[PDB]
Scaffold this active site. Structure first.
Site, PDB file in Angstrom:
ATOM      1  N   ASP B 212       0.700  -1.402   0.176  1.00 26.00           N
ATOM      2  CA  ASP B 212      -0.009   0.494  -0.078  1.00 26.00           C
ATOM      3  C   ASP B 212       1.061   1.148  -0.330  1.00 26.00           C
ATOM      4  OD1 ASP B 212       0.100  -1.029   2.946  1.00 26.00           O
ATOM      5  OD2 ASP B 212       0.455   1.075   3.441  1.00 26.00           O
ATOM      6  N   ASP B 214       0.387   3.703   2.725  1.00 26.81           N
ATOM      7  CA  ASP B 214      -0.409   4.163   3.538  1.00 26.81           C
ATOM      8  C   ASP B 214      -1.531   5.251   3.660  1.00 26.81           C
ATOM      9  OD1 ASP B 214       0.311   4.344   6.012  1.00 26.81           O
ATOM     10  OD2 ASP B 214       1.895   5.639   5.995  1.00 26.81           O
TER      11      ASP B 214
HETATM   12  C1  LIG Z   1      -3.978  -7.389   7.460  1.00 23.93           C
HETATM   13  C2  LIG Z   1      -3.368  -6.921   7.844  1.00 23.93           C
HETATM   14  C3  LIG Z   1      -3.006  -5.589   7.853  1.00 23.93           C
HETATM   15  S1  LIG Z   1      -2.154  -4.083   7.485  1.00 23.93           S
HETATM   16  C4  LIG Z   1      -0.743  -4.323   8.865  1.00 23.93           C
HETATM   17  C5  LIG Z   1      -0.165  -5.618   9.359  1.00 23.93           C
HETATM   18  N1  LIG Z   1       0.855  -5.771   8.252  1.00 23.93           N
HETATM   19  C6  LIG Z   1       1.865  -4.117   7.616  1.00 23.93           C
HETATM   20  C7  LIG Z   1       1.642  -3.334   7.233  1.00 23.93           C
HETATM   21  C8  LIG Z   1       1.175  -3.265   5.865  1.00 23.93           C
HETATM   22  N2  LIG Z   1       1.160  -1.841   5.426  1.00 23.93           N
HETATM   23  C9  LIG Z   1       1.123  -1.486   6.265  1.00 23.93           C
HETATM   24  C10 LIG Z   1       0.688   0.818   6.389  1.00 23.93           C
HETATM   25  N3  LIG Z   1       0.725   1.203   5.633  1.00 23.93           N
HETATM   26  N4  LIG Z   1       1.110   1.025   8.258  1.00 23.93           N
HETATM   27  C11 LIG Z   1       1.821   0.568   8.988  1.00 23.93           C
HETATM   28  N5  LIG Z   1       2.185  -0.604   8.964  1.00 23.93           N
HETATM   29  C12 LIG Z   1       1.866  -1.753   8.046  1.00 23.93           C
HETATM   30  C13 LIG Z   1       2.222  -4.201   9.911  1.00 23.93           C
HETATM   31  O1  LIG Z   1       3.221  -4.543  10.008  1.00 23.93           O
HETATM   32  C14 LIG Z   1       0.893  -4.944  10.689  1.00 23.93           C
HETATM   33  O2  LIG Z   1       1.534  -6.303  10.879  1.00 23.93           O
END
Ligand SMILES: CCCSC[C@H]1N[C@@H](c2c[nH]c3c(N)ncnc23)[C@H](O)[C@@H]1O
Ligand SMILES: CCCSC[C@H]1N[C@@H](c2c[nH]c3c(N)ncnc23)[C@H](O)[C@@H]1O
Ligand SMILES: CCCSC[C@H]1N[C@@H](c2c[nH]c3c(N)ncnc23)[C@H](O)[C@@H]1O
Ligand SMILES: [Cl-]
Ligand code: NA
Lengths: 273, 273, 273
Positions: B212, B214
Site C-alpha cells: 500500500d 499508507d
Molecule cells: C491485514 C493486515 C493489515 S496491514 C497491518 C500489518 N501489516 C504491516 C503493514 C502493512 N502496511 C502498513 C502500513 N501502511 N502501516 C503500518 N503497518 C503496515 C504491519 O506490520 C502490520 O502487522
C-alpha cells in the site's frame, strides 16, 4: 544552608569524591533507590552521592527507579542535584571528553513514569503538570560553566540532550534524524530524572560528558560499550574535578529566592480536587 | 553449517515453502513463541519457519512475543534469520508489490521489551547495550538483492523502515512527518525483532513487501486491511520465490568470520557486575 | 435518530449544558469510565455527557480510561461524540481563546492502549487495524465550523494536534520540534480517544480551545496550570455556546449513510482467525 545530591552515571559515580563518608540505605514510597546513599562533604558542603546504575552498574536505564532516587535525595534534605551522564555527541564540535552543560532535552523514552503524582501515592496527591520550558537550573549551570573555564576544560555552555529508551543504541537513521531535530547529545538517562527533580522543587543540573559520536559518521567508528568505557577511563577525572571545584562555590552563594521560586512552581503545578 | 530461521509476516508465512516438514512446539524463558516451529529444508539447507502472528494471524503486532520468537530460533540452532514483512510505501518509486531489502529503521514503538537482558532472567545476565549502526546483515542483504535481480523482481537495494506501535494505521499528519524524517517504508513489526536478533548474534535480514502507499497521497486511496490482503494475494509468490532461491546460495557460502564478528559484538555489548 | 456523546475536558465539562439531567454510573469490559454518564437533552437531541478527568478533575491524562469512556458512550447508544480539549497553541495566529476544529493528530503518547481488540476481551475479537487517514468526522467538523462562524467566534477550520504523554508540559526543545513537524496545537488527551471512537464506528469531532502558547516563545510567558485555568475561566462559555448551537443542527440532518460508512470501515478493519 545547601545540601547537594550527586547522581553519578556510567564510570562517573566515584564515592572517593566525598570526605567523611557514611553509607545509608533508605526506602521510599516508590521503592528502593538504585543503591545506598553516600553521605559526606566537599569542603564545608553537605553532599549525598547516589550511583544511578548501582555501584556495580547492574541496573539498565529503563529499570532505574528515577522516582525513588529523586524522592530519596529530597527526603535526605537535598536543595540541589548535580548529576553526571555519559553521552554520545551529535555535533562535530562536541568531541569525546568534552563536557556539555545541557539546557534542554527531547524525550524519546517510552517505558518510564515521569511524575510522583500518579494517583496511587498518599504522599503526592493530585494531578501535577510541571512546566518544562527551563528544565535545568540556570544558576547552577552558570556556576558549572564558569568553573569549567577556571579549570581550562573543553566545555559547551548549552546543549539539547535526546534521551532514548534503550538499552540498545540508536540506528544510523535515528542518529541522523535526531540531528535534524536539533539534538546535540544523546543518552538514556536524563528523562525523567530532570522532570522528577523539578516536581520535587530541587535545583537540577547535568554534567554531560561526551564519550562517543554515536553512529552518524558512517565513515568513522561507531559507538560500543568498550568505546564508551575507554573514553570514561581517560576523562572521568574532569567531571570529578568539576564537581569538587563547583560545589564549594554553590555553598558560598545565596539560594533562598531561587529555591522559593522553584518551590512555588512545583506547588502551583498541582491540581487538587 | 548454516540453519535459516524464517519469520513469516502477514500473508507471507507459507509452510509449503519447506520440504520434509515437522511441527515442533517449544518453550522459552520469555514464554511461548507465536506458534509451533516448522522444521524443514530448502534444497540441502536446514530451515525453521515461524509465523509472526500465529498461523491463523491472531496476534497483533504489539503482542507478538519478539523475545520468545528470537530465543526459540536461536535455541533451535539458527545462524540466520530472514523475515518477510508487509509494509506501506512512503516513496512514489516504491510501488505496491515491490520488494525493499531494508537497511535501517526508525523506532516509533512504545510498548515493547527490546532486550533479553532485563535483569530478570538468569539466561541473560547483565546490562546489554547492543550497537544498531548496521542493524541488518549486509552479506545476507547482498545475496537477497542479487537473487531478486536474477529473478527479475522489482527490488530496492536499501530503505529505512519506520516501525509504529499500532495496531491503528498512521494519521496523514504522521505519514507526512515520517517522510520528512527519511523513512521509506512503514510497518508494525521490524522493531524489536531486528534488535533481539542482534543481541542473539544472528545474521538478520528482512524482505519488506510494499502492500500500500499508507495515506500520504490525500488524492489517492488510503491503506486498509482489505487493500493490504489483496496486494499480498497478488504478490506473495515473489517473496516465496526469493526465499527459495536465496537460501541455497546462503548455504553454499562461508559464514564463519561473519558469525564470529556478530558473536563478538553481542558478547562485548554486555556489562557484567 | 442521533445521540451525542460529549466528553468534557479541562474546565470544559459543564453538566448545566444539558436539560433534563440524570446521572448514570456504568461498567464496561475495560473498567469504569472517568465518572457517571450524565443523560440529558439539548433542545430535542439526546445527549450523554462525560467528564474526561472526572467531575473533580482527579484523573491525569495518562490514567484516563479512554477504552471505558468510548465503550460506555457507544453502549449508551451514541452515534456521535463531540469533545472539548484545552490545548497549547504552536502557531502565532492561534491565539489563546481561539477554537481549532482539528482534523489531524501526531501521536507522542507512550503508555496507552489504543485498541479495543487486545486479544483479551470476548466482546472485541480479532486483530483490528483501523484506518487513521481521516481521524475526525468531516461532516460534524463542517457543522462546528459553520456554527462557530454564525456565533462570530475566532475559529480555525483545520489543525494538527500533537498529543504528548504528560503529565509534564513539553520542554522548549520539544515545543520547537513539534512546530517543525507541522503540529499546530498540543494536548495530552486526543490520542487514543479519537482512535477508539473510530474503532467503535462513532462520528468523532473535537473542539480544541487554545489556552496558552506552550513555551516556544522564549521571550514570552510560558504555560502553567494557573495560566491554563485563567484562559478557560475567560473563554469556556464559547465552547458551551458552540455545543448548544451545533447539536440541534446535527439532530436536524441525515446521518444514515455517514454512519453506515463508518460502521463498514470499522467492521472491515477486523481480521478474524
Ligand atoms: C491485514 C493486515 C493489515 S496491514 C497491518 C500489518 N501489516 C504491516 C503493514 C502493512 N502496511 C502498513 C502500513 N501502511 N502501516 C503500518 N503497518 C503496515 C504491519 O506490520 C502490520 O502487522
Ligand atoms: C558502558 C555503558 C555503555 S553506554 C550506555 C550508557 N551511557 C549513556 C550513553 C553513552 N553514549 C550513548 C549513546 N551514543 N547513545 C545513547 N546512550 C549513550 C547512556 O545514558 C547509557 O546509560
Ligand atoms: C489545569 C490543567 C493544566 S493544562 C494540562 C491539561 N490541558 C491540556 C493542555 C493545555 N495546554 C497544554 C500544553 N501547552 N501542552 C500539553 N497539554 C496541554 C492537556 O490535554 C492536559 O489534560
Ligand atoms: Cl517520537
Ligand atoms: Na510504554
Amino acid at each position: 544552608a545547601v545540601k547537594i545530591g550527586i547522581i553519578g552515571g556510567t564510570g562517573l559515580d566515584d564515592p572517593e569524591i566525598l570526605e567523611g563518608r557514611t553509607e545509608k540505605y533508605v526506602d521510599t514510597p516508590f521503592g528502593k533507590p538504585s543503591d545506598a546513599l553516600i553521605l559526606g562533604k566537599i569542603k564545608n558542603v553537605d553532599c549525598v552521592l547516589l550511583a544511578r546504575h548501582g555501584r556495580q552498574h547492574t541496573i539498565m536505564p529503563s529499570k532505574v527507579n528515577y522516582q525513588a532516587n529523586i524522592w530519596a535525595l529530597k527526603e535526605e534534605g537535598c536543595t540541589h542535584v548535580i548529576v553526571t551522564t555519559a553521552c554520545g555527541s551529535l555535533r562535530e564540535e562536541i568531541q569525546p571528553g568534552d563536557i556539555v552543560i545541557i539546557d534542554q532535552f527531547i524525550d524519546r523514552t517510552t517505558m518510564r513514569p515521569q511524575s510522583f503524582y500518579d494517583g496511587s501515592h498518599s504522599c503526592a496527591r493530585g494531578v501535577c503538570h510541571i512546566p518544562m520550558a527551563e528544565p535545568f537550573c540556570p544558576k547552577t549551570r552558570e556556576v558549572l560553566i564558569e568553573t569549567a573555564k577556571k579549570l581550562g576544560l573543553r566545555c559547551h555552555s548549552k546543549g539539547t540532550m535526546v534521551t532514548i529508551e534503550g538499552p540498545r543504541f540508536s540506528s544510523r537513521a535515528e542518529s541522523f534524524m535526531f540531528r535534524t531535530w536539533g539534538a546535540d547529545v544523546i543518552n538514556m538517562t536524563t528523562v525523567p530524572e530532570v522532570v522528577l527533580a523539578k516536581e520535587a522543587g530541587i535545583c537540577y543540573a547535568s554534567i554531560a560528558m561526551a564519550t562517543d559520536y554515536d553512529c552518524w559518521k558512517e565513515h568513522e567508528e561507531a559507538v560500543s560499550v568498550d568505546r564508551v568505557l575507554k573514553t570514561l577511563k581517560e576523562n572521568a577525572n574532569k567531571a570529578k574535578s568539576l564537581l569538587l571545584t563547583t560545589i564549594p562555590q554553590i555553598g558560598s552563594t545565596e539560594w533562598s529566592e531561587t529555591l522559593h521560586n522553584l518551590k512555588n512552581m512545583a506547588q502551583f503545578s498541582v491540581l487538587l480536587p
